[PDB]
Design a protein around this nucleic acid. Structure first.
Ligand SMILES: Nc1ncnc2c1ncn2[C@@H]1O[C@H](COP(=O)(O)OP(=O)(O)OP(=O)(O)O)[C@@H](O)[C@H]1O
Ligand SMILES: [Mn+2]
Ligand SMILES: [Mn+2]
Ligand SMILES: [Zn+2]
Ligand SMILES: [Zn+2]
Ligand SMILES: [Zn+2]
Lengths: 280, 97, 162, 105, 84, 171, 112, 532
RNA sequence: AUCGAGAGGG
DNA sequence: ACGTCCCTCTCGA
């Protein structure tokens, strides 16, 4: 019932999960136009944790003798300390970081930080490091101009839909959205220099590696994403009940509010067999 | 062995658009019927060793094409024709949408 | 395979294909192409020479033989129908040099009669209307006789001396 | 919008003032707003030029767009007519901010 | 009735399905005794023969991506990317 | 008459043809089929016009097959006879019940019951002739015939004509 | 507001038996059901009654009469359904049949 | 194969569903069905000019059709007809024949309710498909009279509570009358062009008047063959003789002496044979038996199996395999140990190309009985040239462009499989690796995605007959390509049983290797750098 | 060969 | 209203 119900459903070429008639089912498969394989579950450090030690990771103030980047963490050390044409961008940044610390607490209420998203960042750095070989003692060689305006450009490129007008675009910034919060979280003008010890080239490799690895994650216009869904949901269910005779009865095998609870859903029907308001 | 429903699925999943057309046409069924540019129904007379194609009834020997469909379908379509519902088969179009 | 398109009596009753409002090769409502045995004749010749030009890029009853060489050169002999046609036109076309045909064409479609009258009028050489409008029935009321014969007398003038 | 606090019968005259269709609510369902709910996304009214702009950009014919029905709790809550559209915006666990679209019959 | 490249929008990369039909397609042709373009460095096989062609974008083929409304953006194998 | 319609033709070649002068073979493959033919829809497809500037369009590679289809849109000269279109022509077949006439690529035929009552046929003549009061048609003569009906028979299209009604015969 | 509950009520039986899936799949189905106006069901009379293709449908629970109302309501099959092709033995508008390949002499003389 | 046909080859783009005019039938038909006897002029193996090939198609493999002079394998079947003695209901349109008697004035035949009435002018613009039908019904089944003008639409009579009691239609009036087909059609024939169009019909493909069968389509022998069991015709052949026996009797009843209560029954029995040949799971009824039930067209097409869920949305396939499947530590993920005896019978079209010709001529010149052999080979004339036997199998020097159905050999794009089969990961492709013993052999770590084991499980195997398809199976359905599952977005394969059970035995720091044994380990790694 | 019923194999 | 996919046997009109 699933499969000859989805069947028909494949991404198109403009990025529109559709059918036999031309009618949308989604404007971006997965809402994010991402293929499933190219996706793993890494946490968002910009959400969970104390408002306290949040700054103690992400906030950098050039106007301050105690809360600035001690040159031992980048070459331009004294010649920046104080600087303010730049502390605007340090500001510009830590403002988008904390606009995002809430923009997640709005979508991911549970306090749940680990989720699935293209590009294993948490991995690409000890890629760069192991490759280029960092020194945790001699300090970097990036401008504060460098970092934050790269990360700002990397996002400009991470495409998904291509298109001229502001409609498609405004759909564009929607799909990339969650990602970028990943980026700022971890391409973090403090963390980059405090924790990551990045050189210059090391960085803008990471930058360009993300960029492909991303345009690789995108789903491919053709994918029979319909008859694909059906088997992904149907498969489990058959072996949620083709394998209960392994023990000797116990519980939630295949005859307890399960495989049949699904029997309800797809058919609708009004006579639900365990209704229940859960009232707060 | 039967390439079943349950598997037409698994291949549609994969994309294999024309290898699916092989197991369904080359590796079984497959045919060559002569249809009509009017009555969309396998009816013309295939006097090929002579090159005479007629579809009397709608008297024409010009508007005549040719198809690669499973004998099965061919049947299903003759069968539907007995129960008197004409499944005219066309190659032009007029939708677009 | 067979040769597509893009889309009765001598009463301008012509097929749907040979119907006036017929489609251009570019898709725009363009009129229709009816042309007389001379207006023929040449448009094959000049068509058959530009062929020979391409493939080598890799007078009295005298015009009978010099075209016969082309139809053994230009288009392989695989074409009995076309040979006889260049023949037929040469001995039955009324006009030699392209100057004269344009003139005829220019005086023909002043009248604004149907192409098949433009055609068949510069082809059957007609002395009076009684012969002109008979073999060409469609005229009848379309053109005053006098006026038709002013034209048909002017045809009479321009016959190239074979 | 005429609120009745307990009951109205047929005596059926609402749609006889072209051009003015009148919504009719009830205090029994107005007491608690449905729109404040955790699972009720922000539907936003689209204009007649904000419509013919989705229908060209995304290469649609009216048909092909997902749908909301005239009696939809919210459609009524904005009084959506037939051919009016909407921009249901919502958090997503993936995109982070998907932006569906529904028309209304 | 067509799209002009200047206004193209579809993925500029080449799709698993484009490619694998392209590698497939030519490979069938090649083994049907077709004129090959890249210079055999010694390949009996035609899937590889084509694949070399692929890695020299010496394949005279246009994919014609169709859109839901009907119209199509052509895309040279010469011009599509290839990453995957 | 004599027309010029802008027709089409879908032709397909084997993979072993994509590389050199595809156009040169496709051009000649079109001529191999269309040049020297006849149908009833169009009529005597008689001469492909404008050689160098003919179209070939894009090539559509066939699915499980490995070929390609090309809609060559070519313009040419056609010839379609119609009832009642008086033609002027030469005679080639003289019978006893009527003399055939060649006009263009199609052969129009006459009957002795269509020729006015003064054509006393003469079989004892070299070559075969038909006598009269003053005229005499023979093997190669010029005449004005009027088509009465036409019939398409495979790759040709013959027709019957008249000589009875006025302003006809007199060449 | 339903969409997310129907989903939530699907999610909850599958993430029960551990397992796990990736939103999209589910989401797809849900969205399939909700994007009509209201809960269209996964059953011969639920979705299958749709305006889709004719043969496309006659592959699900009601079969002959489907073609029947068809033959008489002069129904029409687009033929853009996968299944219409299976039925027909055409390569079906699927991943590797989504598009369409074409040659071009101008690349064919570039490469010669 | 089949002979070349100089017709345009296209594909199918629209499928226009219509209804047979009783006159399209009478037209498209070769001869005229009259006699109910199969091919028994004389029990003679020659057919009879009444039923079964009066020009409809031949039954004996060594004779041609009396119309299309082709030879069974390319004569598709021709249709004839039976002229009915009195019109008859179509078993399937029945309720929707009533359902339009329920909507028009059974005397002058215009819509009960027309362009005046709010919910009729509001249904009458439901441009939706047949939903305007339904609404035009519900909102008509009730008005049981015409009208003089009403606050002018013509007759003015009254309509009946028409209800259906098996195969026939009754209709009261407050006087009880039964609706006769010969009237019902004349009310449909008189339905007005505008009426059935907004009502639910069509001006050419499906007139309503043709839910009444006047002329009958005679399907040809391929639909209903005979088999040598001296022969034995087909359930649909016998049934149609019963119809042509149920018709004839009624043809004459209504000819010579017409005794009303005689013709009343045989016409309600002719419409029983006509109705029973198309549907046979009717509402009440007896389920007509064939001296047994009797197969009915509808039931042939039914789900489960039967043309749609059985012979199209699924069929069986040449070039397929099967056997017990065992598992192999000394094998690679992406290849499958197929036995010889499959590889000797598993062919594969291959073209003659200068890059291989120096190979194919050694396989031919091998043969069907040797490992890398060939089982046929196809010339340009395309006639099958069997190696196993043909004299010339000896020499036969090949010509370029030919095709040598040869033996499937190592590393060939194969479609491998297990049977539950409900997902992609359970129909992956492999490289071949022809081996001994009768059992398919596959790498332990591609168990899971198939959920297969080595205690009794068979497995399927397919083999593309082309190149592109191989590509499609190599560059899409490969085993390494599907190493990570979209479904659960994680890797769907991994180390198991013996390997896993002792890999932790090995990754102990209690676990030590000495000099000798180490090298033996090193070597085994096929991509070793050879550095100790 | 065809339909109908029956036991086992994953 | 349909009622998991496939496969191997054996037997009565
Ligand atoms: N009734 C069935 N329907 C579908 N698949 C089945 C069925 N019975 C077995 N299978 C298939 O067989 C496999 C498991 O059956 P099997 O009895 O071999 O399991 P098992 O675990 O070996 O047996 P045991 O449980 O005694 O160890 C699965 O791939 C399953 O899909
Ligand atoms: Mn087991
Ligand atoms: Mn097992
Ligand atoms: Zn017809
Ligand atoms: Zn025949
Ligand atoms: Zn009336």
């Amino acid at each position: 019932r699933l499969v000859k119900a989805l069947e028909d459903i494949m991404v198109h070429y403009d990025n529109t999960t559709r059918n036999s008639l031309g009618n949308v089912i989604q404007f971006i498969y997965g809402e994010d136009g991402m293929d499933a394989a190219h996706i793993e579950k890494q946490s968002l450090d910009t959400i969970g944790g104390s408002d306290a030690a949040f700054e103690k990771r992400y906030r950098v103030d050039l106007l301050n003798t105690d809360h600035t980047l001690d040159p031992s963490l980048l070459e331009s050390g004294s010649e920046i300390l104080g600087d303010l044409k730049l502390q605007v961008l340090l500001d510009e940044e830590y403002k988008q970081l904390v606009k995002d610390r809430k923009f997640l607490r709005e979508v991911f209420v549970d306090g749940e930080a680990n989720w699935p998203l293209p590009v294993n960042i948490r991995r690409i750095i000890q890629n760069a490091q192991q490759t280029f070989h960092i020194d945790h003692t001699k300090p970097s060689d990036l401008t504060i101009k460098d970092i934050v305006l790269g990360v700002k450009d990397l996002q400009e490129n991470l495409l998904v839909l291509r298109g001229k007008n502001e409609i498609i675009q405004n759909a564009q910034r929607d799909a990339v959205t969650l990602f970028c919060c990943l980026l700022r979280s971890r391409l973090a003008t403090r963390r980059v220099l405090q924790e990551y010890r990045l050189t210059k080239q090391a960085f803008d490799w990471v930058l360009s590696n993300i960029e492909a690895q991303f345009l690789r994650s995108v789903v491919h216009p053709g994918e029979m994403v319909g008859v694909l869904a059906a088997q992904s949901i149907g498969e489990p269910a058959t072996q949620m009940t083709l394998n209960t005779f392994h023990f000797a009865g116990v519980a939630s095998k295949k005859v307890t509010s399960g495989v049949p609870r699904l029997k309800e859903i797809l058919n609708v029907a009004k006579n639900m067999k365990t209704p229940s308001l859960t009232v707060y | 062995l039967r390439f079943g429903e349950m598997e037409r699925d698994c291949m549609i999943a994969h994309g294999a658009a024309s290898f699916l057309k092989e197991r369904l046409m080359e590796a079984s069924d497959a045919f060559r019927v002569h249809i009509c540019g009017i009555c969309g129904l396998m009816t013309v007379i295939a006097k090929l060793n002579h090159n005479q194609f007629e579809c009397k009834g709608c008297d024409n020997k010009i508007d005549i094409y040719q198809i690669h469909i499973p004998y099965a379908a061919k049947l299903l379509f003759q069968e539907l024709m007995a129960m008197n519902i004409t499944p005219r088969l066309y190659t032009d179009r007029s939708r677009d949408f | 395979v067979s040769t597509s398109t893009f889309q009765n009596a001598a009463t301008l009753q012509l097929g749907q294909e040979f119907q006036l409002k017929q489609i251009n090769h570019q898709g725009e409502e363009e009129e229709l192409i009816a042309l007389n045995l001379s207006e023929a004749r040449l448009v094959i010749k000049e068509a058959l020479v530009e062929r020979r030009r391409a493939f080598k890029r890799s007078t009295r009853e005298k015009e009978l033989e010099s075209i016969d060489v082309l139809l053994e050169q230009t288009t392989g002999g695989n074409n009995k129908d076309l040979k006889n046609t260049m023949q037929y036109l040469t001995n039955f076309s009324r006009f030699r040099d392209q100057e004269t045909v344009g003139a005829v064409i220019q005086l023909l479609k002043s009248t604004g009669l149907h192409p098949f009258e433009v055609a068949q009028l510069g082809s059957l050489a007609c002395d009076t209307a009684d012969e002109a409008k008979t073999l060409i029935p469609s005229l009848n009321n379309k053109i005053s006789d006098d006026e038709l014969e002013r034209i048909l007398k002017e045809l009479s003038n321009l016959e190239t001396l074979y | 919008i005429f609120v009745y606090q307990n009951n109205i019968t047929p005596s059926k005259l609402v749609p006889s003032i072209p051009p003015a269709t009148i919504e009719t609510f009830n205090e029994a369902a107005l007491v608690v707003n449905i729109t404040h709910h955790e699972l009720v996304p922000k539907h936003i009214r689209l204009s007649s030029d904000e419509k013919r702009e989705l229908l060209k950009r995304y290469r649609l014919k009216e048909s092909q767009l997902p749908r909301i029905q005239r009696a939809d709790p919210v459609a009524l809550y904005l009084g959506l007519k037939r051919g009016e559209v909407v921009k249901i915006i919502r958090k997503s666990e993936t995109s982070g901010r998907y932006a569906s679209y529904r028309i209304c019959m | 009735k067509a799209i002009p490249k200047d206004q193209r929008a579809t993925t500029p990369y080449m799709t698993k399905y484009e490619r694998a039909r392209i590698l497939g397609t030519r490979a069938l042709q090649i083994s049907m005794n077709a004129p090959v373009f890249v210079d055999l460095e010694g390949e009996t096989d035609p899937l590889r023969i084509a694949m070399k062609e692929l890695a020299e974008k010496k394949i005279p083929l246009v994919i014609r991506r169709y859109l839901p409304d009907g119209s199509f953006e052509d895309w040279s194998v010469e011009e599509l990317i290839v990453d995957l | 008459m004599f027309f010029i319609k802008d027709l089409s033709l879908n032709i397909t070649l084997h993979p072993s043809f994509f590389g050199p002068r595809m156009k040169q073979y496709l051009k000649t493959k079109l001529l191999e089929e269309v040049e020297g033919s006849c149908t009833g829809k169009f009529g005597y497809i008689l001469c492909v016009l404008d050689y160098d500037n003919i179209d070939i369009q894009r090539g559509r590679i066939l699915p499980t097959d490995g070929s390609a289809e090309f809609n060559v849109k070519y313009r040419a000269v056609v010839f379609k006879p119609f009832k009642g279109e008086v033609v002027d022509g030469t005679v080639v077949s003289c019978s006893q019940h009527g003399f055939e006439v060649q006009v263009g690529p199609m052969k129009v035929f006459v009957t002795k019951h269509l020729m006015p009552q003064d054509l006393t046929f003469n079989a004892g003549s070299n070559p075969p002739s038909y006598q009269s009061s003053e005229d005499v048609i023979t093997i190669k003569s010029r005449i004005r015939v009027k088509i009465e009906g036409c019939i398409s028979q495979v790759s040709s299209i013959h027709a019957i004509g008249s000589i009875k009604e006025d302003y006809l015969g007199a060449i | 507001a339903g969409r997310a509950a129907l989903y939530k009520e699907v999610y909850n039986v599958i993430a029960s038996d551990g397992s796990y899936v990736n939103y999209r799949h589910m989401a797809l189905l849900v969205d399939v059901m909700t994007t009509q106006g209201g809960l269209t069901s996964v059953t011969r009379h639920g979705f299958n009654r749709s305006n889709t293709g004719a043969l496309m449908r006659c592959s699900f629970e009601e079969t002959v009469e489907i073609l029947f109302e068809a033959g008489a309501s002069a129904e029409l099959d687009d033929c853009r359904g996968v299944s219409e092709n299976v039925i027909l033995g055409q390569m079906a508008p699927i991943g590797t049949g989504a598009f369409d390949v074409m040659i071009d002499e101008e690349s064919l003389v570039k490469y010669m | 194969g089949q002979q070349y046909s100089s017709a345009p080859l296209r594909t199918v783009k629209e499928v226009q569903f219509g209804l047979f005019s009783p006159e399209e039938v009478r037209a498209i038909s070769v001869a005229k069905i009259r006699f109910p006897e199969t091919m028994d002029e004389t029990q003679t193996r020659a057919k009879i000019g009444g039923l079964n090939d009066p020009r409809l198609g031949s039954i004996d493999r060594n004779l041609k059709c009396q119309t299309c002079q082709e030879g069974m394998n390319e004569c598709p079947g021709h249709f004839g007809h039976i002229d009915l003695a009195k019109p008859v209901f179509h078993v399937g349109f029945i309720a929707k024949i009533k359902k339009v008697c329920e909507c028009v004035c059974m005397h002058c035949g215009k819509l009960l309710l027309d362009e005046h009435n709010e919910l009729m002018r509001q249904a009458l613009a439901i441009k939706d498909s047949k939903k305007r039908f339904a609404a035009i019904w519900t909102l008509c089944k009730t008005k049981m009279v015409c009208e003089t003008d009403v606050p002018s639409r013509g007759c003015g009579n009254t309509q009946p509570t028409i209800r259906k009691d098996g195969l026939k239609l009754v209709g009261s009036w407050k006087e009880l009358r039964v609706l006769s087909t010969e009237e019902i059609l004349n009310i449909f024939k008189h339905i007005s062009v505008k009426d059935f169009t907004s009502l639910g019909f069509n001006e050419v493909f499906s007139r309503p008047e043709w839910m009444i069968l006047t002329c009958l389509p005679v399907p040809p022998p391929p639909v209903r063959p005979s088999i040598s069991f001296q022969r034995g015709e087909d359930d649909l052949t016998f049934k149609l003789a019963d119809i042509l026996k149920a018709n004839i009797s009624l043809e004459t009843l209504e000819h010579n002496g017409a005794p009303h209560h005689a013709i009343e029954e045989a016409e309600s029995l002719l419409q029983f044979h006509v109705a029973t040949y198309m549907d046979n799971d009717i509402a009440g009824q007896p389920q007509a038996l064939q001296k047994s039930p009797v197969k009915s067209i509808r039931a042939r097409l039914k789900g489960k199996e039967g043309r749609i869920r059985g012979n199209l949305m699924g069929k069986r396939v040449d070039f397929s395999a099967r056997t017990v499947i065992s598992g192999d530590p000394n094998l690679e993920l992406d290849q499958v140990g197929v036995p010889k005896s499959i590889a000797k019978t598993l062919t594969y079209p291959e073209v003659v190309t200068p890059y291989n010709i120096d190979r194919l001529t050694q396989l031919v010149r091998n043969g069907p009985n040797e490992h890398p052999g060939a089982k046929y080979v196809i010339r340009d004339s395309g006639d099958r040239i069997d190696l196993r036997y043909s004299k010339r199998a000896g020499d036969i020097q090949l010509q370029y462009g030919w095709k040598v159905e040869r033996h499937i050999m190592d590393n060939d794009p194969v479609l491998f499989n297990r049977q539950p089969s409900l997902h992609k990961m359970s129909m992956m492709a492999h490289r071949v690796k022809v081996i001994p013993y009768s059992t398919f052999r596959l790498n332990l770590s591609v168990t899971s995605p198939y959920n297969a084991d080595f205690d009794g499980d068979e497995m399927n195997l397919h083999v593309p007959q082309s190149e592109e398809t191989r590509a499609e199976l190599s560059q899409l359905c490969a085993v390494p390509l599907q190493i990570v599952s979209p479904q659960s977005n994680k890797p769907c394969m991994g180390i198991v049983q013996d390997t896993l059970c002792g890999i932790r035995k090995l990754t102990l720091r209690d676990t030590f290797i000495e000099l000798d044994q180490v090298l033996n380990m090193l070597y085994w790694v096929p991509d070793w750098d050879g550095v100790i």
